[PDB]
């Protein structure tokens, strides 16, 4: 939630990793609980040795973290489905991003809310003449 | 017209003495030189084509024109009615990928009744579909 | 971030694309945060005055440079052999060969020979010394300052025009037909008869002279009473010398018809009488629409009354569609301006109305090609603003069953028939060209298909050309339309039968095929543009294109993958077609007039019927003097056009990079360049404020389109100018 | 109020099959918005780029279908 | 018969005030 | 390279002004403007 | 050969046989009657 | 940020949620289809606009739309 | 093996055209003056003009692949 507990995996070091945006604007951090000491391909580049137990990996974009989560959930026979993706600011605060409700978004649970859901078809969208100078969008209003 | 005919043009009569033999017949340039004499030429010695619709020059344009208007219509009718008779057998996709070649040969031979069949299909209503039962695009 | 001020969504992204998108949406005032309906019109009005002052500064700059650095006083002494001078050269990179070759037309400084028609214009207007057109340059500077002050004062809240003033269509169509098109043509006919025609008669009329002498010795009273034949009493005879008094009978409005035999131009009295006869009809037609006075017409009742059985609901509820929107008005304005700009081009080479401009062949070629390349732009922009109107400003619940909605209801018939016409012209024009090119390649050019263009020759036959022998309606002298006793019979007949001028040129068998090629380019460009305008709202792929806007990159790789799905991308392809067909007609025009001016008409009449004749006798032969603008031996005055030739080739191929390659490659490359700058030791001091990204998809499409366009234009303005200035200069 | 296998024309005015006929594969229970499963023979623009086919079955409403049988 | 230097400098001075007036128009068109 | 016209001294200073001095201060003012907040 | 009749009746082989027959009769008509610009 | 609007034509097939590689879509309960669920996009500030959800959807003219609006550091996908 | 059959029938076509429809023995009689040609064109539509005079009375299209010099090198 606010503190990241984990060890860095065995990796020699790469060039496509954390650039100067990490210590300035934001970075991301994936934490998961392994079973054995297997090998995984990080989206930064090359392969790395996944450490045994709870390990922590710092990445630069959220898409790399979700691509690693896809690689952890599909490309292993002990399917690692207990990973947590946090967003780390340079101020020190840590925001729990995924799977923050607690259950994966692919299945439904009670406690979520329908954000960004329309009550019409796309053919029932309004025309851009009646809202020509309101400043809004033809899909929003 | 301001164009001189090839029977008396001086540049054409100067150029017809050395027409090149196209085919293996060694007198092909000479028989071409007397075949193109009926046409009319400009000031360069090449046969122009009057296309205005006057029948005295219809051999330039109109006589091959309707000739193509047969053959294209033949191909069009052979391509059209064949699709109609593969609108259902069991599956039209394979019958469009591989050809039902006896059915195709039957249409290819029978396609020479195409203009009377075209007026017949236009009168029966099975040529032009309705403007509402056609899968149009949204406005 | 302060830039851009108008857009809030572009003032917050840290990327470098907000600078480009802030540049290219600076004039789209509809997508500005916080702009109401009337502020749109008032900002348009002030920006209109800014543009109308920029165009006066440009005309004043042309006038000032002909006054200052031009040999205008030495050009009027012998305008058949000496060359006009645009301006002087002051770049410090000139060596010695580039100074010894650019001191042309008799001037010790390096100059630049003018190829626009400003010298023949200013001589036909009546300007003789440099002082009067320098005073015209100062007058245009003051007039441009006047329109700048108008643009400033029409932004104050006191003098701010209301929205109902801009919606007042009938109270400005009257003033644009009478007080702008009529009384200004009336003032131009007045300047013609007062200054331009007496300077063609030798009498120097200035601002301190026109109040004393009359243009006609009969006075103003024969116009007030009647019997106007004394205004055409004695015209200028065939033995008249321009600018002097020699055989020049004084009569201000003489309708002759045909050409001046000394200047190969129209008679200046005929020009003045024409402008009077158009000013009268424009002031008459300006009193049509209803204003505060109850007499006139209101356009709502005219449009609502034009119904029909086959038409549908007619033009009902259509005045509000044009008057509320602005892209409909801009599309109609650009369409009418494009057709009349090509009308300018087609009537400034066959009916020249400037002193000795039919002899300066490079000037006529540059002016014709410039106006055709403006007309193609304006036609493409008319259809582009039609697509913007269909995206933004079209409502189907108010335009119900009228001609616009019924146009949209059968768009799959329209663009399929344009597809048929384009394939019909294209398959067989290319088929005949490849057939001709093969049979000439096989040594048998008698097997060419040379279809005689009998329809156009029939039009020349009913225009006056008795060359083809078709005795129809004007070449037959006993016709009904010939024996009417009108004024334009003998002069126009002898002008159209003279085989020296460029009026109604002898149409040979090649012009049949090339005019079918221009019909091909016109039909295909109309195909892409109408398909863009009618599918601007939607289609079977995405019927929410009204919701996405005009220009947007794609809709992803799904549903087949909709690259170039917007109507902006139909403009994109139609821009290449407009450049292509304008290149076709200008290659055709320049080769025809190179056969006419040199007297070797047989070269164009023999070689243009096949494609290698174009590739040999036009592109390979006429460009021999262009590429020899700088050899290892020496440098002549055509070196700047050889450098512009290679420059145009370079920009035309630079657009190929943005066209062929797409964004994702360049983003992966820019990631590596960003890494190299962030890990270089001594360049870690200098860091970007905005994050550098690749150019966007629609953006770099537009950049590659711009390079294709200006590369095309620069290499053709190099070749078209230098080839006919090397042949005739 | 349709059976299972009757021809019906579509009046969606925003779909790929607009005016094309389709056979109702099934009509589902009431309460839901678009219960009418309609199958066609002509697939639409669907899937990734270069895909061999698309989809044909679709859930439609009741008031946008014109029965032709 | 040609121009003089004072006519060129007077042309620059009489075109100096369109520069100030276009600067005023550009400033009020920005705001 | 000289000038036979009147005021030949004037392009000698107006060509480097519009070539260097005008675009350097225009790009300087624009880069200060478009990168400020 | 229940599959050879289907392979010889696919679209490329049938369109190549038809274009070979069309080019054959066109070349034969152009050999026995060459150089016909008109009728 | 972009705007991911999800219309009522969604049949709850949850293909778009498992296709999007950024965790913006998620299935919320609903009562208008057989699956009794509809996709929803709360985390629209993380959507890059890749339109990978508009490649796996079975409805005619797919029930989820991604309107490409403003851009930021997340929506442009920058690691620098 | 199938592609090797394609290369072998292509190489067979080169040696067959050098045997039947060429002037290899005529070029071997005079290599400096006359020019090799291993393709004769059927005169049908006027393409008999492609059979240029390559030297020694033999008509045809002059080859530029230069496998005649390969054959003289082989023997
Ligand atoms: C020389 C290049 C070239 C050629 C031939 C074409 C030709 C065509 N374009 Mg086109 N186009 C080009 C460049 C070219 N384009 C470029 C650079 C752009 C800018 C991106 C466009 C953008 C463009 C648009 C946007 C559109 C077209 C369309 C068309 C077609 C209708 C126009 C026409 O003249 O009818 C037909 C003319 C022809 C010349 C066709 C004959 C082609 C060959 C000779 C047919 C012979 C068969 C051939 C030999 C079989 C090959 C066998 C081989 C496998 C061994 C036509 C096929 C339109 C279209 O397709 O819809 C109608 C359309 O909407 N073009
Ligand atoms: C034989 C079937 C057939 C028929 C009856 C038609 C009929 C038509 N087509 Mg067409 N078309 C066909 C096949 C056919 N097409 C194919 C296979 C193609 C892909 C190359 C096209 C591509 C095409 C375009 C791009 C356009 C048309 C258009 C048109 C209409 C105007 C006439 C025209 O220009 O056609 C001329 C036909 C062509 C230019 C292409 C066809 C050439 C092939 C060789 C014809 C034979 C096809 C097939 C092999 C024969 C089947 C025989 C069967 C026993 C297996 C007309 C209704 C135009 C339109 O919309 O009009 C409003 C139009 O713009 N067609
Ligand atoms: C290294 C090569 C080089 C360079 C640097 C130049 C440079 C120049 N040449 Mg030149 N020239 C060259 C090679 C070169 N030439 C060659 C090889 C030839 C052939 C012999 C010539 C032939 C030639 C002629 C014949 C003439 C010149 C002239 C000029 C001067 C242009 C006057 C000026 O500043 O207008 C300002 C420049 C421009 C307006 C062009 C820039 C257009 C921009 C890119 C587009 C607009 C961008 C944007 C919208 C607005 C700007 C943004 C900015 C304000 C922030 C300039 C000094 C002219 C001269 O002496 O001046 C009177 C002239 O008449 N040259
Ligand atoms: C007598 C009164 C009068 C006059 C002279 C004008 C004049 C003008 N109005 Mg205007 N207006 C008027 C009354 C008048 N208005 C009234 C009463 C209203 C009431 C509602 C308006 C409302 C109005 C609006 C809302 C707008 C204008 C605009 C304009 C300007 C655009 C015209 C232009 O620049 O091209 C002038 C073009 C020509 C004179 C010729 C047209 C082209 C011809 C046909 C081509 C063929 C011949 C050609 C000249 C040959 C060239 C040869 C070459 C050598 C030069 C123009 C200065 C617009 C503006 O601000 O623009 C600055 C604008 O947006 N007016
Ligand atoms: C009367 C003329 C006229 C007017 C008033 C407009 C007005 C408008 N057009 Mg427009 N248009 C016109 C003619 C016109 N157009 C023509 C003739 C075409 C066809 C070529 C177009 C094509 C067109 C498109 C495709 C679009 C518009 C759009 C727009 C709107 C916003 C423009 C904007 O922000 O541009 C901002 C200005 C620029 C991007 C500048 C680009 C132009 C540069 C100068 C070209 C570069 C040339 C290069 C420097 C030369 C180098 C020379 C040398 C150095 C080598 C605006 C209402 C847009 C719209 O409504 O939707 C957003 C839109 O997408 N127009
Ligand atoms: C728009 C018309 C125009 C154009 C294209 C040119 C072009 C040129 N002028 Mg020039 N000039 C003009 C109007 C114009 N002038 C006017 C109206 C005056 C009277 C004050 C002058 C006075 C003038 C002098 C005195 C000299 C030039 C010179 C030159 C040449 C070098 C550039 C230079 O130093 O200019 C600099 C020009 C100035 C400092 C004053 C003119 C500025 C005008 C008024 C602004 C034009 C506004 C323009 C349309 C804005 C474009 C906006 C666009 C980018 C969006 C170049 C060929 C020089 C030359 O001949 O070198 C060989 C030279 O010595 N000009
Ligand atoms: C459009 C305007 C323009 C002008 C007027 C020039 C002018 C010049 N270029 Mg040039 N150039 C231009 C555009 C231009 N270029 C462009 C666009 C490019 C890119 C393609 C180039 C690329 C280029 C190259 C690659 C080279 C030149 C060179 C030269 C110079 C040749 C003589 C020389 O060595 O000068 C000597 C140098 C100078 C006169 C520099 C100016 C220093 C002045 C005198 C100091 C004044 C500063 C003062 C303290 C401040 C006064 C304050 C003010 C308010 C009064 C000449 C001054 C050549 C050169 O050696 O230049 C260095 C050279 O090799 N240019
Ligand atoms: C619009 C397309 C078109 C049309 C109407 C024609 C029409 C004609 N061609 Mg032709 N041709 C075309 C395209 C076309 N061609 C193309 C694209 C090529 C290049 C492959 C040829 C190559 C060609 C040759 C090589 C010959 C003809 C010949 C002929 C003529 C007699 C044809 C025949 O068999 O009898 C006839 C006038 C023959 C002839 O002698 O013409 C008089 C002939 O020998 N054509
Ligand atoms: C899309 C769109 C659009 C656009 C369009 C356009 C762009 C169009 C154009 C069009 C055009 C561009 C047209 C034109 C045409 C014209 C014509 C067609 C004319 C004709 C005339 C006549 C016919 C006359 C006659 C005559 C002659 C010919 C000769 C002799 C003399 C006389 C006079 C008798 C708009 C804007 C609407 C908007 C909406 C959408
Ligand atoms: C004679 C002549 C001429 C004239 C012509 C004309 C003028 C034309 C017109 C044309 C037209 C005015 C047309 C119309 C049309 C329309 C329509 C409507 C059509 C129809 C079609 C269709 C319907 C199709 C069908 C088909 C067939 C028939 C076959 C095949 C299949 C298909 C299906 C394709 C000229 C001068 C050139 C020259 C001389 C001769
Ligand atoms: C080269 C290239 C790039 C890379 C482009 C980059 C990195 C832009 C770099 C531009 C440099 C800085 C030159 C810009 C200066 C020019 C002279 C323009 C002047 C600036 C104007 C504002 C006047 C793309 O991003 C791209 C995207 C989509 C399709 C094709 C392409 C493409 O071809």
Curated annotation (Swiss-Prot), chain B:
Superkingdom, taxonomy of origin = Bacteria
Which Gene Ontology cellular-component terms appear in the entry? Answer: photosystem I; photosystem I reaction center; plasma membrane
- Give me any GO biological process, just one: photosynthesis
- Presence of keyword RNA-binding: no
UniProt record similarity statement: Belongs to the PsaF family.
Q: Describe its function.
A: Probably participates in efficiency of electron transfer from plastocyanin to P700 (or cytochrome c553 in algae and cyanobacteria). This plastocyanin-docking protein contributes to the specific association of plastocyanin to PSI.
Q: Which protein are we looking at? A: Photosystem I reaction center subunit III
From Swiss-Prot, chain C:
The residues that the entry says bind chlorophyll a B1 are 649
Q: Could you name the Gene Ontology cellular component terms for this entry?
A: photosystem I; plasma membrane; plasma membrane-derived thylakoid membrane
Name the reported effect of residue 520 to P: No protein or PSI accumulate, unable to grow photoautotrophically
Q: Does the keyword Methyltransferase apply?
A: no
Q: How is the cofactor bound?
A: PSI electron transfer chain: 5 chlorophyll a, 1 chlorophyll a', 2 phylloquinones and 3 4Fe-4S clusters. PSI core antenna: 90 chlorophyll a, 22 carotenoids, 3 phospholipids and 1 galactolipid. P700 is a chlorophyll a/chlorophyll a' dimer, A0 is one or more chlorophyll a, A1 is one or both phylloquinones and FX is a shared 4Fe-4S iron-sulfur center.
Question: Is-annotated flag, keyword Transcription regulation?
Answer: no
Q: Where does chlorophyll a B3 bind?
A: 657, 665
Record-listed [4Fe-4S] cluster binding positions: 554, 563
Molecular-function annotations in GO:
4 iron, 4 sulfur cluster binding; chlorophyll binding; electron transfer activity; magnesium ion binding; oxidoreductase activity
What is the uppermost EC class here? oxidoreductase
Highest taxon in the source lineage: Bacteria
Q: Which PROSITE patterns match?
A: PHOTOSYSTEM_I_PSAAB
The record lists the membrane-crossing segments as: 44-67, 133-156, 173-197, 271-289, 326-349, 365-391, 413-435, 512-530, 570-591, 638-660, 702-722
Name recorded for this polypeptide = Photosystem I P700 chlorophyll a apoprotein A2
Curated annotation (Swiss-Prot), chain G:
Tell me the compartments it is located in: Cellular thylakoid membrane
Chief location: membrane
Q: Which Pfam families match?
A: PSI_PsaJ
In terms of SUPFAM superfamilies, this protein maps to: Subunit IX of photosystem I reaction centre, PsaJ
Q: Name one GO biological process term.
A: photosynthesis
Q: Which residues cross the membrane?
A: 7-27
What keywords are assigned to this protein?
A: Membrane, Photosynthesis, Photosystem I, Thylakoid, Transmembrane, Transmembrane helix
Superkingdom of origin organism: Bacteria
Q: Which Gene3D superfamilies match?
A: Single helix bin (1.20.5.510)
Q: How does it sit in the membrane?
A: Single-pass membrane protein
Cellular component, GO annotation? photosystem I; plasma membrane-derived thylakoid membrane
Q: Per its database record, what is this protein's job? A: May help in the organization of the PsaE and PsaF subunits.
Q: Which HAMAP family match?
A: PSI_PsaJ (MF_00522)
Family (UniProt): Belongs to the PsaJ family.
- The protein here is known as Photosystem I reaction center subunit IX
Species, as recorded: Synechocystis sp. (strain ATCC 27184 / PCC 6803 / Kazusa)
Taxonomy of origin reads: Bacteria, Bacillati, Cyanobacteriota, Cyanophyceae, Synechococcales
UniProtKB/Swiss-Prot annotation, chain H:
Result of changing residue 13 to D: No detectable PsaC, D or E
Give the residue spans that cross the bilayer: none
Entries under Pfam families matching the protein: Fer4_7 (PF12838)
Q: Which Gene3D superfamilies match?
A: 3.30.70.20
Q: Does the keyword Iron apply?
A: yes
Protein topology in the membrane: Peripheral membrane protein
Which chemical reaction does it catalyze? reduced [plastocyanin] + hnu + oxidized [2Fe-2S]-[ferredoxin] = oxidized [plastocyanin] + reduced [2Fe-2S]-[ferredoxin]
Question: Which positions does UniProt annotate for [4Fe-4S] cluster 2 binding?
Answer: 20, 47, 50, 53
Subcellular localization: Cellular thylakoid membrane
Keyword Iron-sulfur in record: yes
Q: Which cofactor does it need?
A: [4Fe-4S] cluster
One of its GO biological process terms is: photosynthetic electron transport in photosystem I
Chief localization class? membrane
Q: How is the cofactor bound?
A: Binds 2 [4Fe-4S] clusters. Cluster 2 is most probably the spectroscopically characterized electron acceptor FA and cluster 1 is most probably FB.
Q: Which residues bind [4Fe-4S] cluster 1?
A: 10, 13, 16, 57
Q: Which UniProt keyword terms apply here?
A: 4Fe-4S, Electron transport, Iron, Iron-sulfur, Membrane, Metal-binding, Oxidoreductase, Photosynthesis, Photosystem I, Repeat, Thylakoid, Transport
Q: Where is the 4Fe-4S ferredoxin-type domain?
A: 1-30, 38-67
Supply the name of the protein.
Photosystem I iron-sulfur center
From what organism does this protein derive? Synechocystis sp. (strain ATCC 27184 / PCC 6803 / Kazusa)
């Amino acid at each position: 939630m606010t503190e990241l507990s984990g060890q860095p995996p065995k990796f020699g070091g790469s060039t496509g990793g954390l650039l100067s945006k990490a210590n300035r604007e934001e970075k991301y951090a994936i934490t998961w609980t392994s079973a054995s000491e297997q090998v995984f391909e990080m989206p930064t580049g090359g392969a790395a040795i996944m450490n045994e137990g709870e390990n922590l990996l710092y990445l630069a974009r959220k898409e790399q973290c979700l691509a690693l989560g896809t690689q952890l959930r599909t490309k292993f026979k002990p399917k690692i489905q207990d990973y947590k993706i946090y967003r780390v600011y340079p101020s020190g605060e840590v925001q729990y991003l995924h799977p923050a409700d607690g259950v994966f978004p692919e299945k439904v649970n009670e406690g979520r809310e329908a954000q960004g859901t329309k009550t019409r078809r796309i053919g029932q969208n309004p025309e851009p003449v009646t809202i020509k100078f309101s400043g809004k969008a033809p899909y929003e209003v | 017209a301001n164009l001189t005919p090839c029977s008396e043009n001086p540049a054409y009569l100067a150029k017809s003495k050395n027409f090149l033999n196209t085919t293996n017949d060694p007198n092909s340039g000479k028989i071409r030189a007397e075949r193109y004499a009926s046409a009319l030429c400009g000031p360069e010695g090449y046969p122009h084509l009057i296309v205005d619709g006057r029948f005295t020059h219809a051999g330039d344009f109109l006589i091959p024109s309707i000739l193509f208007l047969y053959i294209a219509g033949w191909i069009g009718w052979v391509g059209r009615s064949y699709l109609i008779e593969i609108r259902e057998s069991k599956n039209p996709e394979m019958q469009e990928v591989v050809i039902n070649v006896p059915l195709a040969i039957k249409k290819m031979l029978g396609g020479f009744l195409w203009p009377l069949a075209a007026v017949g299909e236009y009168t029966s209503g099975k040529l032009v579909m309705k403007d509402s039962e056609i899968p149009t695009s949204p406005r | 971030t302060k830039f851009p001020k108008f857009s809030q969504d572009l003032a917050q992204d840290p990327t470098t694309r907000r600078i480009w998108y802030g540049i290219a949406t600076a004039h789209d005032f509809e997508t500005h945060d916080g702009m109401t309906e009337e502020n749109l019109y008032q900002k348009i009005f002030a920006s209109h005055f800014g543009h109308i002052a920029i165009i006066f500064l440009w005309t004043s700059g042309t006038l000032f440079h002909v006054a200052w650095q031009g040999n205008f006083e030495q050009w009027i002494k012998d305008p058949l052999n000496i060359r006009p001078i645009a301006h002087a050269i002051w770049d410090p990179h000139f060596g010695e060969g580039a100074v010894n070759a650019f001191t042309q037309a008799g001037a010790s400084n390096p100059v630049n020979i003018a190829y626009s028609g400003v010298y023949h214009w200013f001589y036909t207007i009546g300007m003789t010394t440099n002082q009067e057109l320098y005073s015209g340059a100062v007058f245009l500077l003051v007039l441009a300052s006047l329109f700048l002050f108008a643009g400033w004062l029409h932004l104050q809240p006191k003098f701010r025009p209301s929205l109902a003033w801009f919606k007042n269509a009938e109270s400005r169509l009257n003033h644009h037909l009478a007080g702008l098109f009529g009384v200004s043509s009336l003032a131009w006919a007045g300047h013609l008869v007062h200054v331009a025609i007496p300077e063609a008669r030798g009498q120097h009329v200035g601002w301190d002279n026109f109040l004393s002498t009359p243009p006609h010795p009969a006075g103003l009273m024969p116009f007030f009473t009647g019997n106007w034949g004394v205004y055409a009493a004695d015209p200028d005879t065939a033995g008249h010398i321009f600018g002097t008094s020699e055989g020049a009978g004084t009569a201000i409005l003489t309708f002759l018809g045909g050409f001046h035999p000394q200047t190969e131009s129209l008679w200046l009295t005929d020009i003045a009488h024409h402008h009077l006869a158009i000013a009268v009809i424009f002031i008459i037609a300006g009193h049509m629409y209803r204003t505060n006075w109850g007499i006139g017409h209101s356009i709502k009742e005219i449009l609502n009354a034009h119904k029909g059985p086959l038409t549908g609901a007619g033009h009902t509820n259509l005045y509000d569609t044009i008057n509320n929107s602005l892209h409909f008005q801009l599309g109609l304005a650009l369409a009418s301006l494009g057709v009349i700009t090509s009308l300018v081009a087609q009537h400034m080479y066959s009916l020249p109305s400037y002193a000795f401009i039919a002899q300066d062949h490079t000037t006529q070629a540059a002016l014709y090609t410039h106006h055709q390349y403006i007309a193609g732009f304006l036609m493409v922009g008319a259809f582009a603003h039609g697509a913007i109107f269909f995206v933004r400003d079209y409502d189907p619940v108010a335009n119900k069953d009228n001609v616009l909605a019924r146009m949209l209801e059968h768009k799959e018939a329209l663009i399929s028939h344009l597809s048929w016409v384009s394939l019909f012209l294209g398959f067989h024009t290319l088929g005949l060209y490849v057939h001709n090119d093969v049979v000439v390649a096989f040594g048998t050019p008698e097997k060419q298909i040379l279809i005689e263009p009998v329809f156009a020759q029939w039009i020349q036959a009913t225009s006056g050309k008795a060359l083809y022998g078709f005795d129809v309606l004007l070449s037959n002298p006993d016709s009904i339309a010939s024996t009417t006793g009108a004024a334009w019979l003998p002069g126009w007949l002898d002008a159209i039968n003279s085989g020296t001028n460029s009026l109604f040129l002898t149409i040979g068998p090649g012009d049949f095929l090339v005019h079918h090629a221009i019909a091909l380019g016109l039909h295909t460009t109309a195909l892409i543009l109408i398909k863009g305008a009618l599918d601007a709202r939607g289609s079977k792929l995405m019927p929410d294109k009204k919701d996405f806007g005009y220009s947007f990159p794609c809709d992803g790789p799904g549903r087949g993958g909709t690259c170039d799905i917007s109507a902006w991308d139909a403009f994109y392809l139609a821009m290449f077609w407009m450049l292509n067909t304008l290149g076709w007609l200008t290659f055709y025009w320049h080769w025809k007039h190179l056969g006419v001016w040199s007297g070797n008409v047989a070269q164009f009449n023999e070689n243009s019927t096949y494609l290698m004749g174009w590739f040999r006798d036009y592109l390979w032969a006429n460009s021999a003097q262009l590429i020899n603008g700088y050899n290892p031996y020496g440098v002549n005055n055509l070196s700047v056009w050889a450098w512009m030739f290679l420059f145009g080739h370079l920009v035309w191929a630079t657009g190929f990079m943005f066209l062929i390659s797409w964004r994702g490659y360049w983003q992966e490359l820019i990631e590596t360049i960003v890494w190299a700058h962030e890990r270089t030791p001594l360049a870690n001091l200098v860091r970007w404020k905005d994050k550098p990204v690749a150019l966007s998809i629609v953006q770099a499409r537009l950049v590659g389109l711009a390079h294709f366009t200006v590369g095309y234009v620069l290499t053709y303005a190099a070749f078209l100018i230098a080839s006919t200035a090397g042949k005739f200069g | 109020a349709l059976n299972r296998g009757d021809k019906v024309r579509i009046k969606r005015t925003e779909s790929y099959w607009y005016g094309d006929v389709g056979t109702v594969a099934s009509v589902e229970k009431s309460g839901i918005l678009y219960p009418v499963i309609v199958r066609f023979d002509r697939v639409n623009y669907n899937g990734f780029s270069g895909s061999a086919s698309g989809v044909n079955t679709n859930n439609f409403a009741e008031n946008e279908l014109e029965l032709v049988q | 018969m040609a121009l003089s230097d004072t006519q060129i400098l007077a042309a620059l001075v009489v075109a100096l005030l369109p520069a100030f007036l276009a600067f005023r128009l550009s400033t009020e068109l920005y705001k | 390279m000289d000038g036979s016209y009147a005021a030949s001294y004037l392009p000698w200073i107006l060509i480097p002004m519009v070539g260097w001095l005008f675009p350097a201060v225009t790009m300087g003012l624009l880069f200060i403007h478009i990168e400020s907040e | 050969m229940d599959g050879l009749k289907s392979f010889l009746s696919t679209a490329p082989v049938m369109i190549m046989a038809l274009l070979t027959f069309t080019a054959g009769i066109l070349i034969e008509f152009n050999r026995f009657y060459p150089d016909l610009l008109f009728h | 940020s972009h705007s991911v609007k999800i219309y009522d034509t969604c049949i709850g097939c949850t293909q778009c949620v498992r296709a999007c590689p950024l965790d913006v879509l998620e299935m919320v309960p609903w009562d208008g289809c057989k699956a009794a669920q509809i996709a929803s996009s709360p985390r629209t500030e993380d959507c890059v606009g890749c339109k990978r959800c508009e490649t796996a959807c079975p409805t005619d003219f797919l029930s989820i739309r991604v309107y490409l609006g403003a851009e930021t550091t997340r929506s442009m996908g920058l690691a620098y | 093996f199938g592609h090797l059959a394609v290369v072998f029938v292509w190489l067979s076509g080169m040696y067959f055209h050098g045997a039947k429809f060429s002037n290899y023995e005529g070029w071997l009689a005079d290599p400096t003056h006359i020019k090799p040609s291993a393709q004769v064109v059927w005169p049908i539509v006027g393409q008999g003009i492609l059979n240029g005079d390559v030297g020694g009375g033999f008509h045809g299209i002059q080859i530029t692949s230069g496998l005649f010099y390969l054959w003289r090198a082989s023997g």
